[PDB]
Design an enzyme around this catalytic site. Structure first.
Site, PDB file in Angstrom:
ATOM      1  CB  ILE B 366      -0.984   0.004   1.223  1.00  0.00           C
ATOM      2  CG1 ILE B 366      -0.232   0.012   2.591  1.00  0.00           C
ATOM      3  CG2 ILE B 366      -1.983  -1.139   1.157  1.00  0.00           C
ATOM      4  CD1 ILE B 366      -0.710   1.078   3.621  1.00  0.00           C
ATOM      5  CE1 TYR B 367       2.647   1.793   4.894  1.00  0.00           C
ATOM      6  CE2 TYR B 367       3.699  -0.305   4.389  1.00  0.00           C
ATOM      7  CZ  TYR B 367       2.976   0.497   5.260  1.00  0.00           C
ATOM      8  OH  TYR B 367       2.586   0.012   6.480  1.00  0.00           O
ATOM      9  N   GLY B 368       3.578   2.210  -1.907  1.00  0.00           N
ATOM     10  CA  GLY B 368       4.048   2.725  -3.189  1.00  0.00           C
ATOM     11  C   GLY B 368       4.404   1.658  -4.198  1.00  0.00           C
TER      12      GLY B 368
END
Ligand code: F43
Ligand SMILES: C[C@@H](OP(=O)(O)O)[C@H](NC(=O)CCCCCCS)C(=O)O
Ligand SMILES: O=S(=O)(O)CCS
Ligand SMILES: O=S(=O)(O)CCS
Ligand SMILES: [Br-]
Ligand SMILES: [K+]
Lengths: 548, 443, 258, 548, 111
Positions: B366-368
């Site tokens: 979900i972070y990148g």
């Protein structure tokens, strides 16, 4: 009766505005101000807390109050406040104006819904969208949705945090709960609502409002990430996808790069800053943040409402603090939205144009621009000659240069409907103003104005741009006050002349029409007055976690 | 020469071309076609005339969702692409005998512009190509259709997007394989700012040519960064030879031996046996369990042998599943296994393993990050390995049977369309060996 | 060449080696019919059609690639079947398979695998048809699995490092599997994502700690400490030093300092 | 008695820490937490304000509380707080920790004094310095000193704003008013005070503390500008120079580029941010911000106090919000400063080292690093095997990997006094931990750890650096939690072993010794507890300009 | 010391910073080998030459310089040749007016 500013001047000074002579050094210094009195009574009271360390003392340096410390009437309002009340630091409404922009980020939803229905094989239905929308309103303020033993953000600190939806697809709109929807058909006049939907298409967008406190503790770059971080989690929860799968990475890239719309973009290394800072906001985008277009039918009022917002954000917060600091540039901006001075000049220009060319009745040519721009300028400076109190009010020549040129530019846009034509008009005003009074602004005010005429209609890489896409990082504009806020006003004028629903971005226009926003973007000038009277309640305060 | 190392050149079909060639014949410092690749990358700009035309017609300029009402221009740009190419060529050409090239792609909907190399010789950096093409396009369009002076700013917005307000090319309808210098992670990373899909679209999805192109730019970038200086030059030269240029047919021989019933583990056993056989590694000490701990006889060569096996490991694993998602895991556990199999250091001494750790994470979190194709040597996630991680990634996107959202088609539509036409760009392995043969006796 | 698989002088290092060696048939402990397995995965149902994402390889005009065609694709890729997951949360309390252990076994025994190691979970992404085939024969029916110490999980994987429950089961905040007081076996009432299944599926009897200690791939002060495996520590120290010297100076003289 | 953490574990769980089995699903969900109860009672109470819009509801997604929602005892304190109280958003002390750094900027004064005495011909004397110092304490918070009709910032909003001085020249120190001086001889032990003065020289520095509110409204890049803007004005006033002369430009460049020391530097375009943001702060600089070195004689306590501050700033604020957002990374950091777990492991390592090599008794070699790092790691993981409740506490493997490696690294630094030696030690711990439990951290935790061993002692341009000069922008370190905060601790350990007064910058060390700072940088862990108990009063609140 | 990279290195290079980076590395390798600098002392040699890089994207505290500032600090694209201080043009020319005007005009117009 007569000029619009005369009422305000008669209230500011108890003398005839046309009187060339007055009395000075009889006001007893800073004591004449109920505000300077408060500041001293505060500094005296706070001596104990600071220990021995000296603080604010008006006896250091220049003795303020040798002239009359004049108050300011907000344009279009009967609210007369002290100058100090219009400083961003002292005004909670001005702080929330910026905070409400900084914490805004618009994200596309179609891309995600496509990934759901194609590679994931999960059907998307209005009822599911409604479920997602409830999950994001728990997740976005700092609520747990997937993992066990998660700590959470106090809901009392993030009451202003919410996520909403809007769509051009009228069929999907009727099928989404009214609480989660920003209704284009109900917030905008149907002439404007049809123009917005036509430009947006049948596409669906999510507006995520990160809590005020986040941007206060951190920065503008945090906002898009905070939103994307919680959008992904809400999608995992609502649609019951795997907590860390290959397809998840498509959502993170879309929500952070591909289908994300920020308010401001990043700045170069010299003035290094992340996105969603005032320096990265283009003039057209800021015009679209202001909501007076859907509230007033007056094209002058609409333009001057963007000038107010622009002058405040760009010169008081941006150039006044971010790029400078200290006492700042409060009166460099107030000049453009106080005492109905710019209002009178702009209405003159509108009337001049309306009767000679008609509103949006002349295709842009050098003869039109030069005729309007000279007419409005000569009129503005003549008012300063007629009324010595108007000149005493706008004491700084930069304030006068900005106001006289803004009126000229807005008036050129009223006839042409071209932002660059009005931009060109502004630069003729500047060089005319210089030859009139044999002075202009401060030492380095007309850097962008002397470069102006040549770069206004240029085609070269770092010289060209339609005003809507220019901003605080445009090379010539990147340093000086009494320009940016007024350029945002010249931008609006080109579209108010056309009766356009929006100037550059229809998503931003729709996004800022939401009544769930703390600041009333439809009446910026009245809102600034509300903050100046300490009647504005902002978000981001830490009452639930601090001793009373 | 500088090094005594001799390498046997093999092509994309595992056929011998020449034996006992000096290792430095494949060096960016000596190979003429590597010199051509860099020179042409730095000077070639993809132009979207259809995009520029649509942008004006509608007023949709300066970023996504941006539309300026009341500033629309209907011009038959694509229809008169032949006059625009003649005007652009004339504005950029220095002499009738120079390398200036202005060509039409997809029936004049697109356009390929190559600045004369002299312009770059007197230029400090590569962005000159985007800027001079942008200006030449503006001057061409405005003069051809007699665009009004007040309408002219919209033409700039249609070509360069929101520049100069944005320091990057936001909403631009002109592209280069190289991203703007402002977006560099570190200094010298310029040649690393090439998307995985761009390498895959240019090669036309050919594995050996994708690995070669990515390895060539990545290893050439190591020389710019100052990472291939002194003791490290040999490490990077052998890495470019064995991993990207199929030296001694190592890459293909390992794929041939493990194609049918091979796993990552078998590829590891194959490269260890091969390395031990050629005497690049010898047994150091035998452990209590009977486990033989190996030591390198040739440090730089063992790393190159391991790097070549890494490419073979992705061809075998990603090619068995016909998916590019496996790459992050394949790059991770090829190095993880090779270390606990022999006791020797993995590819790039843990750097390629580490790169893969983050690559697995961002291609699944979900972070990148995102799909394997959006990454590059200039990306914060995939920049840690020094030219050894990006080439195996290219081999994976090549075998993927469209199981990606950000597949070559969606991200490298405009960019790929141009360079796939250039001979040396689509088939780099074929021409670097021809370039090595042309210099092999002059060094 | 005869591969070594893993260094070490303890039973734990041998169990890790036996898990990696493709020639070591792992002891079958249970029989879980295919129809029941797919249900716990919660992707599709038995006696049904495999949902596709891309058409079969034969129906595609792909450009020529001499190297690509050498790699023989698995049946799942041949008929263009979709790629789905199956995750395991392994208790640090002598669970038969462990996260990094699983990953190196999969990369040694199975073709075209996408594995992902985390502390609390282990994810395997593979072609649905070939995935279900190894998920039963190898992943569940053998000694590589235990119904109490290996939790089949999609989300909320918390429990791996948590103290066990009253009856020997691992913590599961979503109640996917319950301990049956009657049969003495573990029954999955929900799938790996947490959706309730109409017909509960039994996995079998829980294994006692005594035998889990003989098959486990985890070092513990309770079992075999990593201090005991002097050989494994030697190789790790070497891998560390070879990396350090390799980053400093990649020469044969520098490496004499090993 | 026995392990340090046992006291804390017995208070967190009412069971034997060595007990392998426990009871679950009997705690009644989120209701077991007095904090989750408050959050619901708040969200319910705030429903009216948000209108219809749904808010925080624990019934959405995962039901928190199926296990025991354990509290956290702060290391070295008897304060047991709920996990939620240690989230930066919910903790005013953590917010002030960062705010006090962000608003700090150190400026040199010798350069200005030279310009005054050479080109300007104005003599500089202690009495004049004292006058300047009083002018800057009125100017810096937003007070007018030169121009007429200036509006000012409310002193009640900027009570925390002050400017002080410090010097290595002991002769000038006795001659400056104690209220304006940060006294090196009175705040530091004379062993340390002599080392600071030796490194600083006879040079004179000004520490300017911009008001908290400024960084809250704006950003970290504003700070140096705000300071420079008011430094120049105070110099104009105090020395009666021309209000805009050629020589003034020398002061602006010096105060903004030449003789200015920022806390953090700018970041590249991908993670674009201005200076004075957490990403730009090097590990050594952060170690120097912590003041436990001049308060405690314990080298372990000093190192673990920097770990706490680092873990909080880097993983909770920086990576948790700035770079991510939402629920954040509270327990990724708490693990390193709660329940005395890292404390016990670090003290073991200190004792091991003290008796085998002696504190600072071994020159760094691969045999030393490999001996200590293996010893401490094996011990740490064994404690996790012995005590199931210690494993249940540090449930996430990343927390364990960080804690076990931090203890290993600090212990290598205790013997060697070399930050890179301890850095190398950390990376061996990581790869040992992986082979021990056949797991490490989260999906992408060991990117920097696998690259670690090779880049720890590398000489290549983007690989080399002494740990003191590495930071959140070092390529491998720029993404992942459970690393940065502990690297700041490994940095301190190398200098605590040597009994060094400072690690990288002596100016920063002196600057943060000032009692006029809101946050107590000498006891960070106790201060975090004070904020968690809502006993910390921060600056930057807007009470004087908002309705009550 | 004055270091000039062989022009071929720049021909295969995308931009100018190669000269600073290859000189920085060549200096490190030279100093470390010549004096047999210990592996644990070697990081200090990098800090003495390149300053605080890579934490800082620029050459902060570097003891090596170029007439051209780093590409990160460019105002606009193509401005690379413009990143030359007025004094640099004046010191190079030895304070000769015509030669100072020529040099500055040459770089400015070439830019
Ligand atoms: C959804 C993800 C995927 C992802 O990219 N991040 C997640 C979730 C994310 C969310 C949780 C949001 C929520 O609960 O509503 C946040 C808080 C970050 C955010 N976005 O605000 C977070 N994790 Ni996670 N996350 C954590 C951790 C973990 C540990 C938990 C292992 C266990 O057995 O409990 C595992 C990684 C691993 O196995 O190594 C983990 C993975 C995961 N983590 C899996 C969920 C796995 C699951 O279904 O249980 N986190 C930790 O390792 C400890 C710290 C903890 C963080 C919260 C804090 O610091 O307070 C949080 C850090
Ligand atoms: C990888 C990169 O993200 P993008 O690929 O650019 O979207 C990067 N983020 C981060 O590293 C986020 C760090 C915080 C969350 C992860 C903690 S483990 C950044 O924004 O520059
Ligand atoms: O006096 S100056 O023109 O230098 C600055 C005016 S704000
Ligand atoms: O599950 S992941 O490792 O992807 C993220 C943990 S915070
Ligand atoms: Br045992
Ligand atoms: K802020």
């Amino acid at each position: 009766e007569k000029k619009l500013f005369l009422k305000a001047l008669k209230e500011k000074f108890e003398e005839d505005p046309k009187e060339k002579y007055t009395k000075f050094y009889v006001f007893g210094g800073w004591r004449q101000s109920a505000r300077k009195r408060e500041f001293v009574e505060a500094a005296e009271k706070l001596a104990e807390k600071r220990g021995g360390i000296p603080f604010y003392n008006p006896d250091i340096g220049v003795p303020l109050g040798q002239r009359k410390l004049m108050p300011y009437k907000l344009s279009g309002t009967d609210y007369i406040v002290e100058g100090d009340d219009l400083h961003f630091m002292n005004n909670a409404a001005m702080q929330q104006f910026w905070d409400d922009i900084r914490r805004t980020v618009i994200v596309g939803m179609d891309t995600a819904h496509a990934v759901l229905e194609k590679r994931l094989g999960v059907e998307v239905t209005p009822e599911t969208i409604n479920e997602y929308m409830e999950t994001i309103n728990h997740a976005l303020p700092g609520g747990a949705v997937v993992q066990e033993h998660m700590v959470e953000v106090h809901p009392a600190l993030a009451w202003d945090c919410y996520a909403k939806i809007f769509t051009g697809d009228d069929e999907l709109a009727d099928e989404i709960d009214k609480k989660f929807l920003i209704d284009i058909n109900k917030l905008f006049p149907e002439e404007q609502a049809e123009q917005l939907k036509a430009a947006i298409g049948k596409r669906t967008y999510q507006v995520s409002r990160v809590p005020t406190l986040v941007g206060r503790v951190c920065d503008g770059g945090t906002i898009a990430r905070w939103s994307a971080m919680q959008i992904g989690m809400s999608f995992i929860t609502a649609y019951k996808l795997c907590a860390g799968e290959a397809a998840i990475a498509d959502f993170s890239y879309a929500a952070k790069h591909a289908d994300v719309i920020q308010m401001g973009t990043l700045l170069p290394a010299r003035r290094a800053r992340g996105p969603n800072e005032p320096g990265g906001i283009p003039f057209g985008i800021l015009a679209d943040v202001v909501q007076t277009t859907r509230v007033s039918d007056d094209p002058v009022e609409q333009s001057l409402e963007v000038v107010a917002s622009g002058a405040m954000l760009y010169d008081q917060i941006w150039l006044g603090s971010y790029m400078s600091g200290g006492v700042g540039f409060t009166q460099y901006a107030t000049a453009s939205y106080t005492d109905d001075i710019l209002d009178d000049f702009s209405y003159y220009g509108y009337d001049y144009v309306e009767k000679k060319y008609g509103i949006c009745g002349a295709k842009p040519t050098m003869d039109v621009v030069e005729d309007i721009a000279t007419e409005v300028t000569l009129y503005a400076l003549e008012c300063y000659d007629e009324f010595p109190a108007l000149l005493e009010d706008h004491f700084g020549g930069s304030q006068r240069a900005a106001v006289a040129a803004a009126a000229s530019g807005i008036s050129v846009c009223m006839a042409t409907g071209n932002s660059n034509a009005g931009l060109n008009g502004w630069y003729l005003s500047q060089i005319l103003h210089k030859e009139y009074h044999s002075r202009l602004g401060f030492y380095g005010y007309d850097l962008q104005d002397q470069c102006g005429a040549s770069n206004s209609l240029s085609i070269r890489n770092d010289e060209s741009s339609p005003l809507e896409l220019r901003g605080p990082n445009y090379p010539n504009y990147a340093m000086n006050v009494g320009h940016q806020g007024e350029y945002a006003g010249i931008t609006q004028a080109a579209h108010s002349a056309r009766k356009d629903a929006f100037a550059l971005n229809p998503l931003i226009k729709v996004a800022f029409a939401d009544p769930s926003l703390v600041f009333d973007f439809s009446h910026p000038r009245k809102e600034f007055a509300r903050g100046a009277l300490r009647e504005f309640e902002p978000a981001g305060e830490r009452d639930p976690i601090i001793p009373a | 020469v500088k090094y005594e190392d001799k390498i046997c050149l093999y092509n994309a079909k595992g056929e011998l071309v020449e034996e006992n060639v000096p290792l430095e014949a494949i060096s960016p410092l000596y190979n003429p076609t590597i010199q051509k690749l860099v020179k042409d990358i730095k000077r070639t700009v993809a132009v979207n005339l259809a995009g520029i035309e649509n942008a004006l017609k509608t007023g949709a300029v300066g970023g996504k969702a941006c539309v300026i009402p009341g500033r629309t221009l209907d011009l038959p740009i694509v229809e008169n692409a032949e006059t625009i190419m003649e005007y652009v060529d004339k504005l950029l050409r220095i002499s009738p005998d120079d390398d200036t090239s202005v060509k039409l792609i997809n029936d004049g909907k697109q356009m390929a512009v190559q600045l004369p190399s002299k312009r770059l010789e007197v230029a400090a950096e590569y962005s000159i190509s985007m800027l001079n093409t942008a200006m030449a396009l503006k001057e061409a369009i405005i003069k051809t259709f007699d665009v009004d002076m007040f309408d002219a700013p919209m033409v700039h917005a249609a070509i360069l997007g929101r520049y100069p307000q944005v320091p990057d090319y936001m909403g631009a309808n002109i592209a280069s394989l190289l991203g703007a210098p402002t977006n560099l992670e570190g200094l010298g990373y310029a040649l690393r700012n090439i998307m995985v899909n761009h390498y895959v679209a240019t090669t036309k999805k050919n594995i050996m040519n994708a690995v070669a192109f990515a390895s060539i730019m990545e290893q050439t970038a190591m020389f710019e960064m100052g990472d291939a200086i002194g003791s490290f030059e040999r490490l990077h030269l052998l890495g470019l030879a064995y991993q990207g240029l199929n030296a001694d047919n190592l890459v293909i021989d390992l794929v041939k031996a493990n194609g049918k019933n091979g796993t990552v583990g078998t590829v590891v056993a194959s490269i260890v046996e091969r390395a031990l056989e050629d005497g690049v590694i010898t047994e150091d000490k035998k452990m209590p369990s009977g486990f033989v701990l190996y030591k390198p006889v040739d440090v730089a060569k063992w790393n190159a042998y391991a790097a070549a096996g890494l490419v073979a490991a992705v061809i075998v694993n990603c090619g068995a599943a016909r998916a590019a998602q496996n790459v992050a895991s394949t790059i991770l556990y090829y190095n993880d296994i090779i270390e606990y199999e022999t006791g020797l250091p993995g590819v790039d001494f843990g750097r390629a393993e580490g790169t893969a750790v983050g690559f697995s994470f961002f291609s699944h979190s979900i972070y990148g990050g995102g799909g394997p194709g959006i990454f590059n040597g200039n990306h914060i996630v995939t920049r840690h390995s020094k030219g050894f991680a990006i080439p195996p990634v290219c081999a994976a996107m090549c075998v993927d049977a469209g199981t990606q959202m950000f597949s070559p088609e969606k991200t490298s539509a405009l960019v790929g369309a141009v360079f796939s036409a250039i001979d040396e760009f689509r088939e780099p392995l074929k021409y670097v060996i021809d370039g090595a043969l042309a210099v092999k006796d002059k060094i | 060449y005869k591969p070594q698989f893993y260094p070490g002088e303890t039973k734990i290092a041998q169990n890790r080696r036996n898990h990696m060696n493709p020639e070591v048939e792992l002891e079958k402990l249970r029989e879980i019919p295919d129809e029941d397995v797919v249900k716990i995965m919660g992707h599709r149902q038995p006696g049904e059609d495999y949902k596709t994402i891309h058409p079969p390889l034969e129906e595609m005009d792909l450009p020529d690639d001499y190297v690509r065609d050498l790699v023989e694709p698995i049946n799942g890729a041949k008929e263009g079947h979709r790629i789905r997951y199956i995750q395991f949360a392994d208790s640090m309390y002598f669970a038969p398979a462990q996260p990094y252990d699983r990953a190196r076994t999969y990369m040694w025994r199975f073709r075209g695998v996408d594995t992902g190691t985390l502390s609390g979970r282990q994810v395997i992404e593979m072609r649905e048809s070939d995935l279900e085939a190894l998920s039963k024969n190898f992943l569940i029916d053998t000694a590589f699995f235990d119904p109490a110490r290996c939790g089949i999980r999609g989300a909320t994987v918390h429990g791996h490092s948590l103290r066990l429950d009253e009856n020997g089961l691992m913590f599961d905040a979503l109640q996917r599997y319950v301990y049956d007081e009657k049969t003495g076996h573990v029954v999955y009432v929900k799938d790996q994502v947490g959706r309730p299944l109409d017909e509960p599926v039994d996995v079998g009897e829980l294994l006692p700690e005594e035998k889990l200690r003989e098959i486990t791939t985890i070092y513990r002060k309770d079992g075999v400490p990593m201090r005991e495996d002097k050989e494994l520590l030697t190789i790790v120290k070497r891998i560390h030093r070879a990396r350090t010297l390799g980053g400093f100076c990649p020469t044969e003289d520098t490496f004499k300092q090993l």
